[PDB]
Amino acid sequence: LTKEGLTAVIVGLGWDIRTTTGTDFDLDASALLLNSGGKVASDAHFIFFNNLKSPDGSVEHTGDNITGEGEGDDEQIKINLATVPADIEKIVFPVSIYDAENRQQSFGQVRNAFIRVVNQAGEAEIARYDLSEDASTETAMVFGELYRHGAEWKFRAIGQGYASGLRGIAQDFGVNV
């Protein structure tokens, strides 16, 4: 009498604190909630360090970690798919290094950098990306997206790099930034 949908998910980003002297590694997890035209539903549907919750309340970022201090996921974005508004069709997950050009930083310099998505109904890992190893030369990437498939939600890994940083990503998806 049990049937069948992803309903609550957590995206987790972690990395290790820089051991050499120099500016810290400040990685950032973001989310963009898109409409059926692939555009952010409003500028406040870009969830990041300066906007930690969606207006609808379905997507919340737990807070900005600017060094990597702490084990496991250093930043998390919690998504309650049940309460995502109907107008939202996809939620895309960028990962970036803050101020990477000025700091001359890339994922390959950072130790044990990973991003993952966990199905909270049972803590099963859905997908992981090894940023240190597989996005070595990158400073910003789209990890993946949750998307509607009929009445349910699925995840799709994307793994696409962007040379123009988090701002460039935000621009492509129609954020006024």
**What is the C-alpha radius of gyration for the chain, rounded to an integer number of angstroms?**
16
| Rounded Cα–Cα distance for residues 71 and 128 (Å) | 16
Q: Is 16 annotated as a binding residue?
A: no
Q: Is 134 annotated as a binding residue?
A: no
73 binds Ca ion (CB under 5 A): no
- 13, 26, 79, 107: residue in contact with Ca ion (rule CB under 5 A): 26
Closest CB to Ca ion among 48 and 153?
A: 48
64 binds Ca ion (CB under 5 A): yes
Binding residues for Ca ion, how many (CB under 5 A)? 7
Q: Is 130 annotated as a binding residue?
A: no
The pair phi, psi for residue 134, each rounded to 5°, is: -110, -10
Q: Is 153 annotated as a binding residue?
A: no
User: Which residues are within 8 A (CB) of 118 and not within 5 positions of it... i.e. 6 or more apart?
Assistant: 9, 10, 11, 12, 124, 125, 126
Closest CB to Ca ion among 68 and 165?
A: 68
CB of 105 to Ca ion, least distance (A): 12
Closest CB to Ca ion among 88 and 135?
A: 135
- Tokens 């496991």 correspond to 72
| Rounded Cα–Cα distance for residues 135 and 130 (Å) | 7
113 CA to centre of own chain: 13
User: CB under 5 A: which stretch of 4-12, 24-32, 53-61, 86-94 binds Ca ion?
Assistant: 24-32
Binding site for Ca ion (CB under 5 A): 14, 26, 28, 64, 68, 70, 74
